[PDB]
CSV table of N, CA and C in Angstrom, one decimal:
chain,number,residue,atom,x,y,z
A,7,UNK,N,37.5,-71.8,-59.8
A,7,UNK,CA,38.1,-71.5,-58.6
A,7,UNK,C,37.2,-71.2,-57.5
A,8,UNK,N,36.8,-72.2,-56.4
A,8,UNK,CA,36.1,-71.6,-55.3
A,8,UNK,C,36.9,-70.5,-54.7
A,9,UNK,N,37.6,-70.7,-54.5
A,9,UNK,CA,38.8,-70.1,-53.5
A,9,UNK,C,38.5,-68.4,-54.0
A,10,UNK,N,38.9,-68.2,-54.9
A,10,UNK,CA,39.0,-67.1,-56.0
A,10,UNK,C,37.3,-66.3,-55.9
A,11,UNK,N,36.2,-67.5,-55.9
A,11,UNK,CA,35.0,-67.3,-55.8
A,11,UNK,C,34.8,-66.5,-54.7
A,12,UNK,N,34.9,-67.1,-53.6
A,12,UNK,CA,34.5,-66.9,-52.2
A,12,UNK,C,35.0,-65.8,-51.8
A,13,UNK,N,36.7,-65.3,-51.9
A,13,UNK,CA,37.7,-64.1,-52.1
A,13,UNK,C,35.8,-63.1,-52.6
A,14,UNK,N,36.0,-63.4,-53.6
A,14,UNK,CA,35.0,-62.2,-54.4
A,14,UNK,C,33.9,-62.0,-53.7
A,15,UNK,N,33.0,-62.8,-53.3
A,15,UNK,CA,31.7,-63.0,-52.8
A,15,UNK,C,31.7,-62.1,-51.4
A,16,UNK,N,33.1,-62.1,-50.4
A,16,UNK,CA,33.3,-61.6,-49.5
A,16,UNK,C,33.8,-60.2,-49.5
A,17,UNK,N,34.8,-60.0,-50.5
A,17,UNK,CA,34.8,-58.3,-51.3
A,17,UNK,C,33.6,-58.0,-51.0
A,18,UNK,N,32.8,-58.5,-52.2
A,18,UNK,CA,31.1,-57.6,-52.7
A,18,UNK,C,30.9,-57.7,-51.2
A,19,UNK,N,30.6,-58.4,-50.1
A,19,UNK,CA,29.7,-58.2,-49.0
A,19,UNK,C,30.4,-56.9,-48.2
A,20,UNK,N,32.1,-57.3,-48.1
A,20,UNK,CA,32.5,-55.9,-47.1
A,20,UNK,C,32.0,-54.7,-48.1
A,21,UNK,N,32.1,-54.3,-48.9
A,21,UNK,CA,31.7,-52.9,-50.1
A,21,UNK,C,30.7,-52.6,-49.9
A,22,UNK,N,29.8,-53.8,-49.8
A,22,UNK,CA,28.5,-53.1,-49.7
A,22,UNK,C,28.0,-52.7,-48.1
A,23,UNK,N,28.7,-53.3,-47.0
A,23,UNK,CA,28.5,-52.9,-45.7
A,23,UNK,C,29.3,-51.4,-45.7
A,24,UNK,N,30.5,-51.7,-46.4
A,24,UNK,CA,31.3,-50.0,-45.7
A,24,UNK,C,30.4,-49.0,-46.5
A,25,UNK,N,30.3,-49.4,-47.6
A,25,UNK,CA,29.2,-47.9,-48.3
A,25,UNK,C,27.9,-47.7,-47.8
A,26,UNK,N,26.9,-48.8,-47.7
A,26,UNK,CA,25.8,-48.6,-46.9
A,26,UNK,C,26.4,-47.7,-45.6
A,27,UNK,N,27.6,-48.0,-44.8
A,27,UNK,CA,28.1,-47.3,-43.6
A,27,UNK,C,28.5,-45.8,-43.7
A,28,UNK,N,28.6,-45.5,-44.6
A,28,UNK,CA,29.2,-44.3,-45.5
A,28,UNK,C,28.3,-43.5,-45.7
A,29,UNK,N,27.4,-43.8,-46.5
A,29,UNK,CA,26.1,-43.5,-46.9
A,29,UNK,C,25.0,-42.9,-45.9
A,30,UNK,N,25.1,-43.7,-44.6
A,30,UNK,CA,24.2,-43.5,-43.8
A,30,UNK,C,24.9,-42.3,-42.9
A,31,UNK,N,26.3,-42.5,-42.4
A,31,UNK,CA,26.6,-41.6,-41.6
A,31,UNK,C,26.8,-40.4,-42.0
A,32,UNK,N,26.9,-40.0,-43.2
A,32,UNK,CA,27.7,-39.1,-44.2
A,32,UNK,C,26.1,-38.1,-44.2
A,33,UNK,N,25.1,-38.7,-44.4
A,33,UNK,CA,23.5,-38.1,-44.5
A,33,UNK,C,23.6,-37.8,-43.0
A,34,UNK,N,23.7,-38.7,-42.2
A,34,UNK,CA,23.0,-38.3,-40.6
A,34,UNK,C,24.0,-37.0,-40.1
A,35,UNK,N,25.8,-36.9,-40.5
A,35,UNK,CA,26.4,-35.7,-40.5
A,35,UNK,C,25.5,-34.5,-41.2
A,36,UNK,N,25.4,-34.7,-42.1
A,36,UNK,CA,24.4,-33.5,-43.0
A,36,UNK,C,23.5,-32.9,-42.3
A,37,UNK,N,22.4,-33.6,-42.2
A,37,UNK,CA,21.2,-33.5,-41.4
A,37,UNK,C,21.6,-32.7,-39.8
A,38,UNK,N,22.8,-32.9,-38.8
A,38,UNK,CA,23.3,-32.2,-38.0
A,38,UNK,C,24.0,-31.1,-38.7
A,39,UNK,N,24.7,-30.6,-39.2
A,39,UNK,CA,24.4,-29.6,-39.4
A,39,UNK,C,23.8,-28.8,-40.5
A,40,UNK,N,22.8,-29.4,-40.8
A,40,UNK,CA,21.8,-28.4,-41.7
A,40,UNK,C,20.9,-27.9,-40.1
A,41,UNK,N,20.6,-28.9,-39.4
A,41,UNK,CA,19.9,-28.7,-38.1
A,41,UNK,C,20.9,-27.7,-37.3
A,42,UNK,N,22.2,-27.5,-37.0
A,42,UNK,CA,22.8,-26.6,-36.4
A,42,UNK,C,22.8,-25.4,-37.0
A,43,UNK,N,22.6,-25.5,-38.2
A,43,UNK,CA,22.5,-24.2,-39.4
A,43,UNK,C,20.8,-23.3,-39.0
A,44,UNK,N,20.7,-23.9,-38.9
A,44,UNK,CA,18.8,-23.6,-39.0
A,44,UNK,C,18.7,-23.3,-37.5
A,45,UNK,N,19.2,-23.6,-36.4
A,45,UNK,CA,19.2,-22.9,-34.9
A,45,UNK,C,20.1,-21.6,-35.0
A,46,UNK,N,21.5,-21.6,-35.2
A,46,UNK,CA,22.1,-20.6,-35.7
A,46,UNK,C,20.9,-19.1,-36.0
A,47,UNK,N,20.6,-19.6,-37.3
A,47,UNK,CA,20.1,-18.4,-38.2
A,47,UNK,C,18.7,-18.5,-37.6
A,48,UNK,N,18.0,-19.1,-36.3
A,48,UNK,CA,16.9,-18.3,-36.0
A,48,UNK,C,17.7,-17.7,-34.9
A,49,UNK,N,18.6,-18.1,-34.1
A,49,UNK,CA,18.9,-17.0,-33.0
A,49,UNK,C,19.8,-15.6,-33.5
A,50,UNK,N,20.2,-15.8,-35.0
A,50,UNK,CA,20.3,-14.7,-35.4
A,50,UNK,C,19.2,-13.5,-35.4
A,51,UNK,N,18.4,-14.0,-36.0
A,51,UNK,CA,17.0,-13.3,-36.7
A,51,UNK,C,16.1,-12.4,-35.6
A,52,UNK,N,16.0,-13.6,-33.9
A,52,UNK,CA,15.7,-13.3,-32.5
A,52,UNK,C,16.8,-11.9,-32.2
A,53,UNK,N,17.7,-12.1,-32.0
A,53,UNK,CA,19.4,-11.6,-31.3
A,53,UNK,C,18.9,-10.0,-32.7
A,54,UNK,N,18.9,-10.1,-33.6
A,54,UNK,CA,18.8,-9.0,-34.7
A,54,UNK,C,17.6,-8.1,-34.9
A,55,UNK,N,16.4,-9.1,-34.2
A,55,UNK,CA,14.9,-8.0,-33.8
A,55,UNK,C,15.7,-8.2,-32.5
A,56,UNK,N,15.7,-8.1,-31.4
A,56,UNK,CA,15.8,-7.3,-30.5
A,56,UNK,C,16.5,-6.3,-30.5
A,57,UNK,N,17.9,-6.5,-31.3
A,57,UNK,CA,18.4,-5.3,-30.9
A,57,UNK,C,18.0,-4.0,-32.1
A,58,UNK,N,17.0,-3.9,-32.9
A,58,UNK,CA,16.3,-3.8,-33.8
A,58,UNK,C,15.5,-2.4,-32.1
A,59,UNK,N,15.3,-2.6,-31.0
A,59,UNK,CA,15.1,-2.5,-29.9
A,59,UNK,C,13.7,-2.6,-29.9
């Protein structure tokens, strides 16, 4: 069956585009807030020696 073939061949390609797409945005979310995490808790640290006075 080409038909049946081709069907499949284009599956496997969208799967592998939406997960590579997944994969990438899902890390670059992370990375923002591990990075908003890590500004947070130094202006804690700044904000908690000062008033330390």
């Amino acid at each position: 069956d080409d038909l049946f073939e081709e069907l499949e061949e284009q599956l496997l390609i969208a799967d592998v585009g939406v997960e590579t797409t997944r994969k990438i945005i899902t890390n670059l979310t992370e990375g923002a807030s591990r990075k908003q995490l890590r500004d947070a808790e130094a202006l804690y640290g700044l904000l908690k020696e000062e008033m330390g006075e």
